């Protein structure tokens, strides 16, 4: 909710934010900045479209740089859908660094710079991968060219290295593979995704080896 109070003797715009009545000055920067954008846009549309039953269905072109600015990931998952619903005839031209935002948008709407461009590319194009409804991790790797794990951290490589060690020792857990397994267990914990993947690798390799022995006999 949003309303004006005058009773104190000064004009104050108040809002109900997360169930609490607060002044605009009390809003977080993220909330205020986004409120400001939508409020401004709505005001202009109402003023310029007096003959429409819904003035927000007017025509226009709106440019927004860094749509995710100050937004928590939860909000990033809603923002494009909400804007397009409220302003259905506006042409939006948007920039973003957010895979979460991209997960809500069709690949046809996306224009991607080539990775090693140096500003002699003739034409921008869409990504090859469909982004709308895709997993975040996939968008990061396939569209934004960012690894799922931080490359500058050693622990980021341990599961990969563990797999390589398993493959090098015909699928058997040797002294070296066991040490690394224990390191993974110790660092990430007993119920970690990483450990479960390691366990899975052990189980599949044991089964593959059993098959190989049966075939040899």
């Amino acid at each position: 909710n949003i309303w004006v109070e005058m009773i104190t003797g000064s004009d104050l715009v108040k809002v109900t934010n997360d169930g609490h009545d607060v002044t605009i000055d009390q809003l977080s920067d993220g909330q205020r900045v986004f409120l400001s954008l939508v409020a401004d846009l709505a005001r202009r549309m109402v003023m310029l479209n007096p003959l429409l039953e819904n003035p927000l269905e007017g025509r226009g072109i709106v440019l927004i740089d860094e749509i995710e600015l100050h937004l928590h990931p939860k909000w990033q998952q809603e923002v494009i859908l909400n804007l397009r619903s409220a302003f259905p005839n506006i042409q939006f031209i948007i920039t973003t660094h957010s895979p979460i935002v991209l997960s809500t948008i069709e690949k046809r709407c996306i224009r991607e710079f080539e990775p090693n461009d140096d500003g002699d590319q003739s034409f921008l194009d869409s990504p090859d991968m469909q982004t709308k409804g895709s997993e975040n991790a996939q968008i990061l790797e396939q569209v934004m060219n960012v690894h799922s794990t931080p490359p500058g951290i050693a622990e980021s490589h341990w599961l990969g290295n563990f797999e390589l060690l398993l493959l090098d020792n015909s699928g058997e857990l040797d002294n070296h593979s066991q040490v690394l397994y224990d390191q993974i267990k110790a660092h990430f914990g007993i119920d970690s995704i990483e450990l479960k993947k390691a366990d899975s690798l052990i189980r599949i390799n044991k089964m593959k080896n059993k098959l190989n022995k049966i075939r040899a006999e």
């Binding site: 900045v33 202009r44 310029l48 479209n49 269905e57 440019l63 600015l69 031209i93 948008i105 224009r111």
Partner: protein, 208 residues
């Protein structure tokens, strides 16, 4: 003239408007219906019969770009890339172009914005000038509205001219028709990273 009459009766907006201006009913109503006619779709949303959007954008020796072409979607276009790829440059270029529509809706012969001679020309460009070329669409009666903003580098002897008359011609239709009988007008807005600002309720603009 008979030529304009033919084109106007064929559904050409600019011809209809030219005929209105010379004979200054029929032609006025053609122009006003072109702008105002629309329908409510199955979802209950009003849809103009003549949509207005940016079709295409070309950048020549502008900032990092030697020669770049972009085709835009009618509804939503999202530009992605690493920092320093020129995503902001693209929106800046569009906003400057749109400034020419806004200026001419407000005032006959109004002036829009310009490319910077200090910063906007590509640093290693052999030809020391930049061009931002845009094409806008406004229904099947006005399929192409081309605009070019140009600027030569500081201290270059040959100055490169901008070409903005088509923007002015379209904006004039909106302005003049609106004066006679109210019409709905297009919204143009840019929200860059400057939108993040500390709020002050006590500071009032006393200007307009």
């Amino acid at each position: 003239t008979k030529q304009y009459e033919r084109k106007a009766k064929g559904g050409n907006l600019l011809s209809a408007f030219e005929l209105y201006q010379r004979n200054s009913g029929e032609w006025f109503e053609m122009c006003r219906d072109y702008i105002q006619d629309g329908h409510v779709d199955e979802s209950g949303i009003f849809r103009p019969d003549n949509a207005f959007y940016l079709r295409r954008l070309t950048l020549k020796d502008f900032r990092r770009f030697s020669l770049l072409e972009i085709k835009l979607e009618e509804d939503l276009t999202v530009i992605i890339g690493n920092n320093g790829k020129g995503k902001t440059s693209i929106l800046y270029a569009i906003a400057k172009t749109l400034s020419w529509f806004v200026a001419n809706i407000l005032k006959e012969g109004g002036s829009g914005q310009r490319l910077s001679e200090m910063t906007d020309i590509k640093n290693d460009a052999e030809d020391r000038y930049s061009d931002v070329s845009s094409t806008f669409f406004f229904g099947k009666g006005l399929k192409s509205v081309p605009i070019r903003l140009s600027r030569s580098a500081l201290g270059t002897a040959e100055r490169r001219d901008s070409e903005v008359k088509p923007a002015k011609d379209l904006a004039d239709i909106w302005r003049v028709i609106n004066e006679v009988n109210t019409i709905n007008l297009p919204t143009f807005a840019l929200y860059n990273v400057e939108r993040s600002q500390p709020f002050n309720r006590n500071i009032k603009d006393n200007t307009g």
